[PDB]
């Protein structure tokens, strides 16, 4: 199984603001769609609320501790380990946040597909810091920039 993290962030690793994206970049959202299409996507419960509905054409997997919580069109597991365990037969799994999910996944992640933006936005939640000396930049397309890293 190839564990992959995908996230759009700024120079200070900001990702969210009051349970929302602090920006709107259609180019990044189209990039997110093509990358995630036809694959499992694991997300935190607040990230689902951020989206508002299941992402179409994709197996939406939602992590939560609420044991009676039901969600229409998503599979619910009670830990990241029960998610990865249930997707053992899968070839690739995509983690899309939020911060607590990203943090727990980072040490298990094989690949990273990250969008870095040359701007300083205001916010509250952030992407947890990786170690630049552990990763290798596979692809870097400068338009923001689509940055692919591989451990
Ligand atoms: N720019 C980007 O690429 C991204 C941005 N974001 C932004 O981040 C914000 C949402 O993310 P964030 O606020 O960090 O919250 P998260 O999406 O990380 O979700 C937190 C909640 O998910 C559940 N959860 C998380 N980890 C676990 C675990 N290990 N086991 C069981 N349950 C777990 C818990 O829900 P419960 O209380 O139900 O147990 C917890 O309260 C939004 O503003 C969104 O826009 C999010 C993803 C990507
Ligand atoms: N690179 C990247 N950018 C993001 O904005 C992003 N956002 C999340 C969490 N929040 C979101 C917010 C919006 C959509 C979303 O509307 N995506 C649609 C795009 C539809 C369209 O192109 O019009 C999708 O189909 O995936 C998904 C997740 C997780 N990873 C990300 N990764």
TrEMBL record:
<feature type="domain" description="DHFR">
    <location>
        <begin position="2"/>
        <end position="151"/>
    </location>
</feature>
<feature type="binding site">
    <location>
        <position position="45"/>
    </location>
    <ligand>
        <name>NADPH</name>
    </ligand>
</feature>
<protein>
    <recommendedName>
        <fullName>Dihydrofolate reductase</fullName>
        <ecNumber>1.5.1.3</ecNumber>
    </recommendedName>
</protein>
<feature type="binding site">
    <location>
        <position position="104"/>
    </location>
    <ligand>
        <name>NADPH</name>
    </ligand>
</feature>
<dbReference type="Pfam" id="PF00186">
    <property type="entry name" value="DHFR_1"/>
</dbReference>
<dbReference type="InterPro" id="IPR017925">
    <property type="entry name" value="DHFR_CS"/>
</dbReference>
<feature type="binding site">
    <location>
        <position position="46"/>
    </location>
    <ligand>
        <name>NADPH</name>
    </ligand>
</feature>
<feature type="binding site">
    <location>
        <position position="65"/>
    </location>
    <ligand>
        <name>NADPH</name>
    </ligand>
</feature>
<dbReference type="GO" id="GO:0006730">
    <property type="term" value="P:one-carbon metabolic process"/>
</dbReference>
<dbReference type="GO" id="GO:0046655">
    <property type="term" value="P:folic acid metabolic process"/>
</dbReference>
<feature type="binding site">
    <location>
        <position position="47"/>
    </location>
    <ligand>
        <name>NADPH</name>
    </ligand>
</feature>
<feature type="binding site">
    <location>
        <position position="8"/>
    </location>
    <ligand>
        <name>NADPH</name>
    </ligand>
</feature>
<feature type="binding site">
    <location>
        <position position="15"/>
    </location>
    <ligand>
        <name>NADPH</name>
    </ligand>
</feature>
<keyword id="KW-0521">NADP</keyword>
<dbReference type="GO" id="GO:0005829">
    <property type="term" value="C:cytosol"/>
</dbReference>
<feature type="binding site">
    <location>
        <position position="100"/>
    </location>
    <ligand>
        <name>NADPH</name>
    </ligand>
</feature>
<comment type="similarity">
    <text>Belongs to the dihydrofolate reductase family.</text>
</comment>
<feature type="binding site">
    <location>
        <position position="98"/>
    </location>
    <ligand>
        <name>NADPH</name>
    </ligand>
</feature>
<dbReference type="GO" id="GO:0050661">
    <property type="term" value="F:NADP binding"/>
</dbReference>
<dbReference type="InterPro" id="IPR012259">
    <property type="entry name" value="DHFR"/>
</dbReference>
<feature type="binding site">
    <location>
        <position position="66"/>
    </location>
    <ligand>
        <name>NADPH</name>
    </ligand>
</feature>
<comment type="function">
    <text>Key enzyme in folate metabolism. Catalyzes an essential reaction for de novo glycine and purine synthesis, and for DNA precursor synthesis.</text>
</comment>
<dbReference type="InterPro" id="IPR024072">
    <property type="entry name" value="DHFR-like_dom_sf"/>
</dbReference>
<keyword id="KW-0547">Nucleotide-binding</keyword>
<dbReference type="GO" id="GO:0046452">
    <property type="term" value="P:dihydrofolate metabolic process"/>
</dbReference>
<feature type="binding site">
    <location>
        <position position="64"/>
    </location>
    <ligand>
        <name>NADPH</name>
    </ligand>
</feature>
<dbReference type="GO" id="GO:0046654">
    <property type="term" value="P:tetrahydrofolate biosynthetic process"/>
</dbReference>
<comment type="pathway">
    <text>Cofactor biosynthesis; tetrahydrofolate biosynthesis; 5,6,7,8-tetrahydrofolate from 7,8-dihydrofolate: step 1/1.</text>
</comment>
<feature type="binding site">
    <location>
        <position position="99"/>
    </location>
    <ligand>
        <name>NADPH</name>
    </ligand>
</feature>
<feature type="binding site">
    <location>
        <position position="20"/>
    </location>
    <ligand>
        <name>NADPH</name>
    </ligand>
</feature>
<feature type="binding site">
    <location>
        <position position="50"/>
    </location>
    <ligand>
        <name>NADPH</name>
    </ligand>
</feature>
<dbReference type="GO" id="GO:0004146">
    <property type="term" value="F:dihydrofolate reductase activity"/>
</dbReference>
<keyword id="KW-0554">One-carbon metabolism</keyword>
<feature type="binding site">
    <location>
        <position position="101"/>
    </location>
    <ligand>
        <name>NADPH</name>
    </ligand>
</feature>
<keyword id="KW-0560">Oxidoreductase</keyword>
<dbReference type="InterPro" id="IPR001796">
    <property type="entry name" value="DHFR_dom"/>
</dbReference>
């Amino acid at each position: 199984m190839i564990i992959t993290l995908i996230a759009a962030m700024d120079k200070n690793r900001l990702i969210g603001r009051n349970n929302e994206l602090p920006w709107h970049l259609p180019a990044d959202l189209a990039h997110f769609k093509s990358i995630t299409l036809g694959k499992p996507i694991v997300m935190g419960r607040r990230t689902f609320d951020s989206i508002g509905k299941p992402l179409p054409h994709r197996r939406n997997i939602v992590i939560t501790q609420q044991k009676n919580l039901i969600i229409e069109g998503c599979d619910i597991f009670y830990s990241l380990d029960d998610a990865l365990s249930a997707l053992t037969k899968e070839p690739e799994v995509i983690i899309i946040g939020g911060a607590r999910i990203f943090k727990e996944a980072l040490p298990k992640a094989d690949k990273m597909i990250l969008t870095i933006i040359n701007h300083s936005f205001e916010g509250d939640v952030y992407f947890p810091e990786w170690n630049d000396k552990e990763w290798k930049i596979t692809s870097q397309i400068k338009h923001f920039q689509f940055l692919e890293l591989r451990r």
